Amino acid sequence: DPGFGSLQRRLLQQLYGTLPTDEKIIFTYLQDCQQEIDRIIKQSIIQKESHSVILVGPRQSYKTYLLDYELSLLQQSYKEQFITIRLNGFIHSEQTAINGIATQLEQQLQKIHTISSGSLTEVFEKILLLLDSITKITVVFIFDEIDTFAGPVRQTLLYNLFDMVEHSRVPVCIFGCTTKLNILEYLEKRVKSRFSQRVIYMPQIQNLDDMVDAVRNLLTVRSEISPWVSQWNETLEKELSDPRSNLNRHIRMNFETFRSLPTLKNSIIPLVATSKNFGSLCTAIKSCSFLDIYNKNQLSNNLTGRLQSLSDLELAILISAARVALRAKDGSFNFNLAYAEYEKMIKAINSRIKLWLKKDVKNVWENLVQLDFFTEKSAVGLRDNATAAFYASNYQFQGTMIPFDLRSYQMQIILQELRRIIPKSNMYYSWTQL
Amino acid sequence: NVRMMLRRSMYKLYSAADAEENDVSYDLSLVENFKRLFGKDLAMVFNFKDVDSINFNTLDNFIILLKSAFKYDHVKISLIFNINTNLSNIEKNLRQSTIRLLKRNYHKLDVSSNKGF
Amino acid sequence: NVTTPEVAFREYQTNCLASYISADPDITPSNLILQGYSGTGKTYTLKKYFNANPNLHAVWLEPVELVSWKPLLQAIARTVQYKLKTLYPNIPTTDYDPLQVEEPFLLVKTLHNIFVQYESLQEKTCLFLILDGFDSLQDLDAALFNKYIKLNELLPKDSKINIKFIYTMLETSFLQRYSTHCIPTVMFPRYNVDEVSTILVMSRCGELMEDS
Amino acid sequence: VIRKFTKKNVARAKKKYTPFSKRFKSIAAIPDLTSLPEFYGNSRFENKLKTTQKHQIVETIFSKVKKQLNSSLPARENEFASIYLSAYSAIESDSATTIYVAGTPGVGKTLTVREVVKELLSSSAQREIPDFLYVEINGLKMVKPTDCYETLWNKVSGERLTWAASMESLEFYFKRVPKNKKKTIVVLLDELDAMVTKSQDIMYNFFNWTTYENAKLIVIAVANTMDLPERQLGNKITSRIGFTRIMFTGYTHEELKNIIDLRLKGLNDSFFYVDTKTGNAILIDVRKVRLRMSADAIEIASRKVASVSGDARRALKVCKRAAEIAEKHYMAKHGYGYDGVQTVHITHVMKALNETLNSHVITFMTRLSFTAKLFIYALLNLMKKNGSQEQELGDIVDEIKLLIEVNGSNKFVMEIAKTLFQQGSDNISEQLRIISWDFVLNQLLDAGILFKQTMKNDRICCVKLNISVEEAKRAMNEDETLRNL
Amino acid sequence: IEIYELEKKIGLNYIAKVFSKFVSTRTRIAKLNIQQKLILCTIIQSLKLNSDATIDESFDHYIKAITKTDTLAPLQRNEFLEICTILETCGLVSIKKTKCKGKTKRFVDKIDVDLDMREFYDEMTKISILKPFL
Ligand SMILES: Nc1ncnc2c1ncn2[C@@H]1O[C@H](COP(=O)(O)OP(=O)(O)OP(=O)(O)O)[C@@H](O)[C@H]1O
Numbered sequence A: 001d002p003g004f005g006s007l008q009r010r011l012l013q014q015l016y017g018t019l020p021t022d023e024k025i026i027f028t029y030l031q032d033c034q035q036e037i038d039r040i041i042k043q044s045i046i047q048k049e050s051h052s053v054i055l056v057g058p059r060q061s062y063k064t065y066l067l068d069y070e071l072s073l074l075q076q077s078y079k080e081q082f083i084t085i086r087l088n089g090f091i092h093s094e095q096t097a098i099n100g101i102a103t104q105l106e107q108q109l110q111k112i113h114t115i116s117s118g119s120l121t122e123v124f125e126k127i128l129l130l131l132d133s134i135t136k137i138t139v140v141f142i143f144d145e146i147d148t149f150a151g152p153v154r155q156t157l158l159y160n161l162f163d164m165v166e167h168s169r170v171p172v173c174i175f176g177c178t179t180k181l182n183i184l185e186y187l188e189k190r191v192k193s194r195f196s197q198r199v200i201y202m203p204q205i206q207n208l209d210d211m212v213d214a215v216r217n218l219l220t221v222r223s224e225i226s227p228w229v230s231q232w233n234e235t236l237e238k239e240l241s242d243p244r245s246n247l248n249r250h251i252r253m254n255f256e257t258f259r260s261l262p263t264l265k266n267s268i269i270p271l272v273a274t275s276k277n278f279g280s281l282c283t284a285i286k287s288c289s290f291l292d293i294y295n296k297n298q299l300s301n302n303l304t305g306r307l308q309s310l311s312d313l314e315l316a317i318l319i320s321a322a323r324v325a326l327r328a329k330d331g332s333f334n335f336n337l338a339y340a341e342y343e344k345m346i347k348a349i350n351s352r353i354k355l356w357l358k359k360d361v362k363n364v365w366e367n368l369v370q371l372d373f374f375t376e377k378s379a380v381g382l383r384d385n386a387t388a389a390f391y392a393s394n395y396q397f398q399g400t401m402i403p404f405d406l407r408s409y410q411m412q413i414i415l416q417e418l419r420r421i422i423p424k425s426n427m428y429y430s431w432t433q434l
Numbered sequence B: 001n002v003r004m005m006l007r008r009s010m011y012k013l014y015s016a017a018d019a020e021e022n023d024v025s026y027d028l029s030l031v032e033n034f035k036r037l038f039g040k041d042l043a044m045v046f047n048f049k050d051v052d053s054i055n056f057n058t059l060d061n062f063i064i065l066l067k068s069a070f071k072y073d074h075v076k077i078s079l080i081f082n083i084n085t086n087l088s089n090i091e092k093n094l095r096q097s098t099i100r101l102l103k104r105n106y107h108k109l110d111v112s113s114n115k116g117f
Numbered sequence C: 001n002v003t004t005p006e007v008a009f010r011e012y013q014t015n016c017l018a019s020y021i022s023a024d025p026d027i028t029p030s031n032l033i034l035q036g037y038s039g040t041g042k043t044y045t046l047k048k049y050f051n052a053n054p055n056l057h058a059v060w061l062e063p064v065e066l067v068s069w070k071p072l073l074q075a076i077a078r079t080v081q082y083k084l085k086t087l088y089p090n091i092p093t094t095d096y097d098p099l100q101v102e103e104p105f106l107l108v109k110t111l112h113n114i115f116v117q118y119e120s121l122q123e124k125t126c127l128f129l130i131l132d133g134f135d136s137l138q139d140l141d142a143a144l145f146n147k148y149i150k151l152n153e154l155l156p157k158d159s160k161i162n163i164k165f166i167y168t169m170l171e172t173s174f175l176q177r178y179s180t181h182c183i184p185t186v187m188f189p190r191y192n193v194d195e196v197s198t199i200l201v202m203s204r205c206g207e208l209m210e211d212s
Numbered sequence D: 001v002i003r004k005f006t007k008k009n010v011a012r013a014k015k016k017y018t019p020f021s022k023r024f025k026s027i028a029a030i031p032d033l034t035s036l037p038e039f040y041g042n043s044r045f046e047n048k049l050k051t052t053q054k055h056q057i058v059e060t061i062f063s064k065v066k067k068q069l070n071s072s073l074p075a076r077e078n079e080f081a082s083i084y085l086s087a088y089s090a091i092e093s094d095s096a097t098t099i100y101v102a103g104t105p106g107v108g109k110t111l112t113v114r115e116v117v118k119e120l121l122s123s124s125a126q127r128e129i130p131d132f133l134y135v136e137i138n139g140l141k142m143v144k145p146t147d148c149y150e151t152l153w154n155k156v157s158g159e160r161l162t163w164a165a166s167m168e169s170l171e172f173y174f175k176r177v178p179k180n181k182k183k184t185i186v187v188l189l190d191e192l193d194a195m196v197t198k199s200q201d202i203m204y205n206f207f208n209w210t211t212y213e214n215a216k217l218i219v220i221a222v223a224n225t226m227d228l229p230e231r232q233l234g235n236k237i238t239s240r241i242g243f244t245r246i247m248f249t250g251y252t253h254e255e256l257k258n259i260i261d262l263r264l265k266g267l268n269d270s271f272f273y274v275d276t277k278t279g280n281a282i283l284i285d286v287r288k289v290r291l292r293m294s295a296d297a298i299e300i301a302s303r304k305v306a307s308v309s310g311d312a313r314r315a316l317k318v319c320k321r322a323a324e325i326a327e328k329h330y331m332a333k334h335g336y337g338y339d340g341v342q343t344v345h346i347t348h349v350m351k352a353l354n355e356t357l358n359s360h361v362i363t364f365m366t367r368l369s370f371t372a373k374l375f376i377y378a379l380l381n382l383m384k385k386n387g388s389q390e391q392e393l394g395d396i397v398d399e400i401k402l403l404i405e406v407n408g409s410n411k412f413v414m415e416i417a418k419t420l421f422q423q424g425s426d427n428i429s430e431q432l433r434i435i436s437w438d439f440v441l442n443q444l445l446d447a448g449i450l451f452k453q454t455m456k457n458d459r460i461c462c463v464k465l466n467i468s469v470e471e472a473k474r475a476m477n478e479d480e481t482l483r484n485l
Numbered sequence E: 001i002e003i004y005e006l007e008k009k010i011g012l013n014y015i016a017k018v019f020s021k022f023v024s025t026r027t028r029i030a031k032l033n034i035q036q037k038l039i040l041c042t043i044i045q046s047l048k049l050n051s052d053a054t055i056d057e058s059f060d061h062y063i064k065a066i067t068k069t070d071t072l073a074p075l076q077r078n079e080f081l082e083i084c085t086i087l088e089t090c091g092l093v094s095i096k097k098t099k100c101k102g103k104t105k106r107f108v109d110k111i112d113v114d115l116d117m118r119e120f121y122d123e124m125t126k127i128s129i130l131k132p133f134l
């Protein structure tokens, strides 16, 4: 069935958004923001007016998608009118962004028709000579994660960028993107004064009909590139119009928990791709049993699923450690006290099962630390940045120089949570109460 | 830490191999691409001095890091542990998986100054 | 147009790998995460999947052997252009030094310079960069994975070579740090005792055959 | 040889290391530097960014208004007179001096200093004063703070030296060179707080050269703050800067009106040929259209800006935003594209002023999912229960579990409990965290609503509200379900 | 000499005008709107209990004072910040940014106030509706 292959491929690239530009899908709740971004970028590229605007919205809220759609829209009709410089706040640092701007400037100006050669002082003053200072070429700056350059110490790059926006003869468009709602408070006073205070907040999903209409936009094939298109559109419209269908129930569950269309797309894609024929795809979209299987797999390495993989000695040691941590006031325990509780519990069970020695319980203890059931007391864990991690790697911690049986640990799961989802018919269930 | 241990080991390996026979990165891919540069296989003998004074977490992580080099056909690794007190004091300080790793091919040798007079 | 292998207790994971990994760059995600603890068959299933599909171009890296972020960047820049040399031997290239990469933006620049000389190819292709054990870097912080998430956005959009990242992770908490990025993730849960016994028989019986 | 590490990206400028004190055999051997070809200054990239239009673009009636309101002096006359008199007396007496100027952003410091030195250059062009060299050093436009040493010496001699050699050369030039072989130099130090390092050697050197008898140097230091030397500088530098300091106050609303109507002299209350086929307007099928901005609209913009900051940039941007809003409304009703009387009245200015003042925060938490709002509600309940402004995450988990299991008679809770703890499956086991627990936690962390502490124990890790509690409760009261229980 | 030249022997009056030009919280309060005056009263009251408080902690205290008094309409946080920014440019409220002291260490904006407290109580006790807010 090559027609099913064509329909499956079309549905898959609609779900990945990799359509041609004229066929790109804009959701109805995203349309006002898309028009506002289109007006700003058209006033920059067509009409040579300088602009400064920060896009504020959560992750996966189509900030990059709308900007890329607008730039590819103006790419096909005004190609020689503008160049694009892309900076990302994670990849680029305050010194490295100068070199990135210079290298993108030379490779973008060689694409239409050196600036990037020398030390950092020379490169920066050459960029300033080009920008600080027929039609003029617009320079569009796309600044992702712009909050990292609005720091508390100094904001040199944002100062010079907004100075180029407000006081230069080359027209420049600067788009910032961030997740921080209070991005204007991050800005220094002179940087905020040079900024235009134009902040666009990305639209959120307000009602369930927005999610259903977006799913309808994603899964309806609007071109007749397969013979199965009409039946697929009919069955999809039948499932979406029915309020009691399984797909509507999954959309409602997403609206109540995640409220994220990329989250739903990540489940819809293997439902579409794992089907082998047209009727199998129709049964899959009518039942959505694969969505249940996917949801079960997404939770299988959580705290609930990791406990169900434990052995009887592992579960007994974990219960004993949770008992010792509950009785403690700092919630702290070690291997010796947990082994004392374990041997007490085994004696009171066999008085009313093999007792293992401390040498063999050492391995189960190490596995429980490895599976993130226990953690070291007041441990910071993974550091935020490379500098603090580098500082931590050059320090010898006091919990790594004492013997293992005296190291203080704290529970990632408490005894009440242990009682909740260990089954009532289990052997050690009675000792989850204290 | 483990990073400095590996970096000193790979600098020593590269320096000694070029002394006996272009810059590389001092990590375990130099062990991976050893026969592609030098044309012959490799035998590494690690001599850990003053283990009783070493951080056993760092030593354990370095041993587990060296374990990844067993997937290369041209690599042979020997470890020498200079121990001042006894074996049980260091087997209580390593992981049980590390003890199971070291037990596969190991030899104890009691050589002190005051041995048998 | 991909072959699904048969892995004994990883059938869902193998169907997920078939659903996410294809030669077409349009219907392949930029990032893919395989998450599971030790001995859950992540490497085994990924190797079986790439052995069942020889047309897929994969580059394998062990982030544990590289320890730090700078050797990881240099390893990526070395192995990508070595694979591209051995894949299209008639394409004339320039051998950039991987030790020139000292910063992430230098990796972006070097990958751009490598990828602009394979522009005579016919079809868009996928290069799969497999980081087997990303959170096993001794020197790891919370900001390193964000760079690899957003790396594809700095590379050219209409290139013939489109790099795809497959990450392998151990810790659930490390993965849950990045949940708002909505990366497709396949979970490999810990095996049953029955499955452990079956795997042990089917992988160790023939080794117990020819023991002397 | 085998290297321990490599530096393969070193880019080193071609700057010599020998200072000016060794350039000649003696002090008496130094010639007249004014009669030297490379001294005192005696744009290669501007053709790079040009291309052919291949289009005639549409300039509507509001476009000329928006170009006239860009940042690119009716109210600064006393400050101009003071700065001009001090610099004029220092130039024509061969004196060295420091003029300190401070102010809040956008009050016209840089513009007044540049107009002062423009009028001074006009005075020296007609031989009223000796000729001088003008140098601008902006501290925020330097890669390194020592690069100012490299810049000024390159502006004085034409040499390219390294920074310590440059500062030795400047020290020798200001101190030892006689006045009859020299020229006056006026240096504008803009963004002076950026030139402050740990050891204040740059500030000491720049203000100590002005205390040299032979220097013929005038430093105009422009700063954010009146008491920046008293806050961040040593007592020697504060003594050298001086007691006489010039304050640039924020503008009153009459002066902001004067600035805006000076920008709108040639198009406000004027006629245009509009060409309603396309909307492209030409200043004197085609209609004669009067354009006006309301004087009361400028009044309310100037009054709001003058009360808040006095920033001229803010007032010009407010009026430009109002013109943009009016232009968007105008092009909506005709479909003019880009390729009677139209007025920028009060309501456009009010919509421009309020769009910077309305908060999206309460609107943001209004449109969150049920689980994120349940997180916020449980955090507020814990904050009012134990009185702490910092709550453990395990306490929030137990509070969410308690609120679900206590309000088990609510119909919404009945409908949503299976979703929240099983994802509606009856094949997923009951979970210890709710569905999308880590998702909504990370979402509130990216938004900046929450702060979290760096601990790897999830239960004893603490969480704080970064936003106001009153905003959080006002968001939580808008929901129909959470305002009931 | 410069003031003599601009305004035109020297004398004592020009020396005194130098010291008058190149060198006060009663006049700053007297120029404020009763809405602005309430904000300054709440801010100094906010730094009594916490004594290292943010904008959003000062604004939380301000919304508490209103509901027990019902004097003037309660306003929003952003409006609170611009009146606090109005008190920047007349010289009463000062705003900085530093890492907060606590279990979480990230950067917050704070209010500090140094206005003479002797002249603050004199100006506010004349107005009857503001006396609950001291
Ligand atoms: N150029 C693109 N083409 C197609 N789909 C895209 C493109 N860019 C992003 N997407 C898709 O858009 C969805 C999320 O939007 P997007 O990536 O723009 O988020 P964002 O709000 O910019 O994120 P962040 O704050 O993390 O940078 C995802 O499904 C992603 O795959």
Ligand SMILES: Nc1ncnc2c1ncn2[C@@H]1O[C@H](COP(=O)(O)OP(=O)(O)OP(=O)(O)O)[C@@H](O)[C@H]1O
Pocket (backbone or CB within 6 Å): C007, C008, C009, C010, C036, C037, C038, C039, C040, C041, C042, C043, C044, C045, C170, C199, C202, C203
């Ligand atoms: N499903 C399976 N069928 C057969 N053999 C298996 C299976 N899963 C694992 N094995 C065997 O067990 C070994 C361990 O699995 P594998 O190396 O894939 O684990 P992993 O999850 O990648 O571990 P780690 O995180 O330690 O790298 C495999 O090399 C293989 O020999």
Ligand SMILES: Nc1ncnc2c1ncn2[C@@H]1O[C@H](COP(=O)(O)OP(=O)(O)OP(=O)(O)O)[C@@H](O)[C@H]1O
Pocket (backbone or CB within 6 Å): A190, A193, D070, D071, D072, D073, D074, D075, D076, D103, D104, D105, D106, D107, D108, D109, D110, D111, D112, D259, D312, D313
């Ligand atoms: N008196 C004025 N008359 C006309 N326009 C003015 C006046 N003052 C300021 N402006 C406008 O405001 C802009 C900002 O002024 P300027 O660059 O001098 O500010 P500044 O005081 O140096 O501020 P910052 O501390 O932010 O650098 C000027 O470029 C000009 O467009």
Ligand SMILES: [Mg+2]
Pocket (backbone or CB within 6 Å): A063, A064, A144, A177
């Ligand atoms: Mg983005």
Ligand SMILES: [Mg+2]
Pocket (backbone or CB within 6 Å): C042, C043, C132
């Ligand atoms: Mg593996």
Ligand SMILES: [Mg+2]
Pocket (backbone or CB within 6 Å): D109, D110, D190
């Ligand atoms: Mg200025």
